[PDB]
Design a protein around this ligand. Sequence first.
Ligand SMILES: *C1=CC(=O)c2c(O)ccc(O)c2C1=O
Lengths: 302, 298
Amino acid sequence: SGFRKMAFPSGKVEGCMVQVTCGTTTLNGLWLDDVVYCPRHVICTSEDMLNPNYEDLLIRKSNHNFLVQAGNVQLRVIGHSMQNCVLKLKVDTANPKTPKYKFVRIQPGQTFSVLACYNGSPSGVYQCAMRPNFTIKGSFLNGSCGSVGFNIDYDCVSFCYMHHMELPTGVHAGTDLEGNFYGPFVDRQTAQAAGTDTTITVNVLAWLYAAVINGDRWFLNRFTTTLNDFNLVMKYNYEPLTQDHVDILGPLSAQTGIAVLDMCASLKELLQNGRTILGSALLEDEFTPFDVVRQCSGVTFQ
Amino acid sequence: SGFRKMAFPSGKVEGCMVQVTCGTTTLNGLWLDDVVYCPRHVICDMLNPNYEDLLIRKSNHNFLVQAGNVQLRVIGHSMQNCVLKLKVDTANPKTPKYKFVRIQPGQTFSVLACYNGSPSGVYQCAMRPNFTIKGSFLNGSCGSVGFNIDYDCVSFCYMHHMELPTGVHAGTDLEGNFYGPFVDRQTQAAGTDTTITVNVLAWLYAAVINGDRWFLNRFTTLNDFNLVAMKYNYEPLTQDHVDILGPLSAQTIAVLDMCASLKELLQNMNGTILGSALLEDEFTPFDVVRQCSGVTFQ
Ligand SMILES: *C1=CC(=O)c2c(O)ccc(O)c2C1=O
């Protein structure tokens, strides 16, 4: 029993973290096969970040201008190319610890594990969700460039995030492993602000489904709803519910017997009046239905 | 910068997880050097077992140890308290620098939940004052270990054993000594638990370092506060506690300087601190320094 924010084992990702240094800038890189991936602003300085011409700044760099270190051993850069906001450095040696991997772009509401690193060395690992405003509520200090977010299913690591910058409000922004930013953000020093954030309904519902499997049932009512009316009643800044969403909540709905619209109506009423569910006073929205099924893996009666 | 419940990198521990099978019982084991550590309940099947007789009536080939496909030949077996030690033919080449440490109530560690010798996830948790853990364990997670990483040395401090009726979990250190008055026998109940004040204070320091300061005031002392703390079930604060909070006080406000702010936060909470409305008590002072200074292991 028990329910905790569970991150994936980070060992497979640890074997790929390297240190990338260009000029006076040093950040983390992802060593997969014979290519090292790192944010492209490593070739920048503080003065260039006010209006950087990345293509022009990269032409003025050569292969040995990039120092890639895996522990103490140095990796010779034999090629460099740029893909969106990510810099790709081809090296002479293929990483022997390279796992089976994928580059995947995730959707708002999905969760993943972040391995915070500094100087190519792991500092910690934690779970977080891609917020609807395309930001992540993580924990990052200066030098966390190149720290990656990922999911591990079977023995294949699905890389889905590379950290880049901190927004004024304290949240973090980044790209996928193809260099494309999540949201309307850019890797340049300009006035940028995260848009208004919303609560992930499907994660709150899955988390409520968790609580039921898990002892807490005080919040259930004998009320149902439809799709539109509940999505309209969101005034409380809750993400609208979709048909694919109720199809993902299907397995949890069957295991418990409560339907999605039955819990949608129950969720309404924790909103109208809002003591602790699963030990927390706030409604948690960073637990996907898959996370609940993974930890609350019980039989479904049919 | 942000503050999250941060677990240690589990790579060094993943390389030590193995599967131990005895008869029909299967759990997880810790492969360090040429010894595999696992709960002695693998040798069962029993509600009140005499482990000493059950182990003498067992031989080396009665234990099936698997790392991946690879079978580890058991060339010796011994028992220390509630932990079983299995000598194997091959020393683990992935053995990291390690230490066996018994932690104290209130200290935190990372749990690598495993099933059938394969690591499933990692999460942080604290040793509650009642010597229990509020973790997440399913059937087959027996033998999963808790640990701390300092420099390149892994400090193993917990081995999961059982789930108590209230849903909370109990286990031993790596020497087989249970945490609390629990035994690997069928009935035991966790005693009354309290909140770890020194962790609540350190967590308040973390909020301060991160921008959240709405709760700070300009003034109380030890006696007064633990008078206010005993009723909210906050574990009493000691002088060693404020000396550990010293480094955080210098980096930033003193302990009692913040103690009054906590008194007021207990007395009456209208917002969330660090994004949570509840007072978090699973962050030790070292945990805050680790997350705000960006300490890297290895
Ligand atoms: C799994 C592991 C274990 O160690 C244990 C134990 O020590 C006593 C009773 C039970 O049921 C278990 C168990 O299921």
